[PDB]
């Protein structure tokens, strides 16, 4: 696996942008403004900013405008000329956003500063039906401000691991130590590896580029079972080991001569799958069987309800 596939850089981080705006067009299917006054209020605010002053006492029963919230994603090292994608989601009573248009929404971050301006056409999908109050605009926001970053300062860069592991951190440190000279990398914990980098933006970029594509062997992570129980999904890891036991579950019986099937000890994932398949059960029954076994041991893994 490449280093980039399991590790992020300390200075490279993403930021979240938010904003409020209006979507026009829509072929009806807009907000019922009698229940969403803020749509009309913000439309009037925009019109006043453009040069039209609507009288205070007005019906304002328009159905081609929907008030929406836009979520963006400030990319690392973003420049002013860059364009980023945005997600537009209806707020009030809008039935659909099929062919609407966003109107210059100023996107704001955690520090309440306008970082981008979003405007574009919504794309939504055409029984599993599509979500038609939520759309995406590709390159629908233009950045206006730059985050001051500390990349290229000092001489230590923290490669931050995903899915923390002392062994994986040691493997990454050793791989970098073989590639470069002695003392190039040093593991700080199960998640961070400090690499000594020369001063200067260019040389740091070159070193990170060379490091990122580098291949590292992945040690066996952990015996882990994932039970969702909300989407009816069960996933078992490669290192999951199963211990000999006996399991009895409602309405289940041996094929053949009754209930209380036996489960054999199995050190391989294929053997674990075969043993759990001999115990004929649906995934819904499988979750209960797995939890009951884990309560008694009998399952050499940790199971997480996800």
Please identify which residue in 156, 178, 189, 199 interacts with a copy of itself, judged by CB under 8 A. Answer: 189
Binding to a copy of itself by residue 12, rule CB under 8 A?
Answer: yes
* Residue placing its CB nearer to a copy of itself in the complex, 34 or 199: 34
The only residue of 120, 175, 195, 197 in contact with a copy of itself, by rule CB under 8 A = 120
SS3 188: coil
Q: What sign does the CA torsion over 131, 132, 134, 135 have? A: positive
- Closest approach, Cβ 198 to a copy of itself, in A, equals 14
Give the chain's length: 306
Choose which of 111, 113, 140, 176 interacts with a copy of itself (CB under 8 A).
140
Q: In angstroms, give the least distance from the CB of 128 to a copy of itself.
A: 6
Chain positions 193 to 212 lying near a copy of itself, rule: CB under 8 A, are 201-202, 205-206, 208-210, 212
> In this structure, are residues 117 and 142 in contact, taking their beta carbons and an 8 Å threshold?
yes
By CB under 8 A, the residues from 259 to 278 that bind a copy of itself are 259-260, 262, 265, 269-270, 272-273, 276-277
Give me the least distance between CB of 191 and a copy of itself, in Å please. Answer: 4
Q: How many amino acids of this chain bind a copy of itself (CB under 8 A)? A: 198
Distance CA 279, CA 246 (A): 10
- For the bound state, the minimum distance from the C-beta of residue 250 to a copy of itself, rounded and expressed in Å, comes to 3
Give the residue, chosen from 175, 187, 195, 197, that forms a contact with a copy of itself under the rule CB under 8 A.
187
Cβ(195)–Cβ(159) below 8 Å: yes
Locus of tokens 């399952």: 299
- Minimum CB separation of residue 180 from a copy of itself in Å reads 16
Whether 289 and 279 have beta carbons less than 8 Å apart is answered as yes
Binding to a copy of itself by residue 27, rule CB under 8 A?
yes
Residue 114 CB, nearest approach to a copy of itself (Å): 9
Interior angle at CA 113, CA 112 and CA 118, nearest 5: 110
Is residue 12 within 8 Å of residue 59, measured between CB atoms? Answer: no
* Residue whose CB is less far from a copy of itself, 98 or 115: 98
- Other C-beta atoms lying within 10 Å of the C-beta of residue 242: 26
Beta-bridge mates of residue 17: 72
| Residue among 188, 200, 57, 73 nearest 137 (CA) | 73
Phi-psi region of 29 (alpha: psi -120 to 50; beta: other; left: phi over 0): left
Beta carbon of residue 257, minimum distance to a copy of itself (angstroms, whole number): 7
* 69 scored as a contact of a copy of itself (CB under 8 A): yes
Residue 241 near a copy of itself by CB under 8 A: yes
């Amino acid at each position: 696996e490449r280093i980039r596939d399991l590790t992020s850089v300390q200075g490279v981080r993403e930021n979240s942008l938010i904003g409020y705006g209006l979507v026009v067009g829509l072929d009806g299917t807009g907000d019922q403004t009698t229940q969403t006054p803020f749509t009309t209020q913000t439309l009037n605010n925009m019109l006043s900013q453009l040069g039209i002053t609507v009288p205070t006492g007005t019906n304002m029963q328009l159905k081609n405008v929907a008030a929406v919230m836009v979520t963006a994603s400030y990319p690392p090292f973003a420049r002013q000329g860059q364009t980023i994608d945005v997600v537009v989601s209806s707020m009030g009573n809008a039935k659909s956003l099929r062919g609407g248009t966003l109107l210059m929404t100023p996107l704001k971050g955690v520090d309440s500063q306008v970082y981008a301006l979003a405007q574009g056409n919504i794309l939504v999908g055409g029984v599993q039906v599509n979500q038609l109050n939520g759309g995406r605009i590709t390159n629908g926001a233009i950045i206006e401000r730059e985050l001051p970053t500390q990349f290229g300062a000092g001489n230590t860069i923290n490669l931050q691991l995903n899915d923390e592991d002392f062994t994986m951190a040691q493997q990454i440190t050793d791989a970098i130590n073989r590639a470069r000279g002695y003392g190039s990398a040093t593991a700080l914990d199960a998640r961070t590896v400090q690499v000594r980098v020369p001063s200067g933006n260019s040389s740091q970029v070159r070193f990170l580029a060379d490091i990122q594509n580098m291949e590292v062997n992945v040690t066996p992570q952990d015996a882990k079972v994932v039970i969702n129980s909300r989407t009816g999904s069960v996933v078992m890891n490669r290192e999951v080991t199963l211990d000999s036991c006996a399991v009895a579950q409602g309405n289940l019986s041996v094929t053949v001569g009754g209930s209380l099937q036996s489960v054999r000890s199995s050190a391989n994932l294929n053997s674990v799958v075969r043993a759990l398949n001999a115990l004929g059960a649906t995934p819904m029954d499988l979750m209960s069987i797995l939890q009951s076994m884990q309560s008694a041991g009998c399952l050499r893994a940790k199971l997480e309800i996800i």
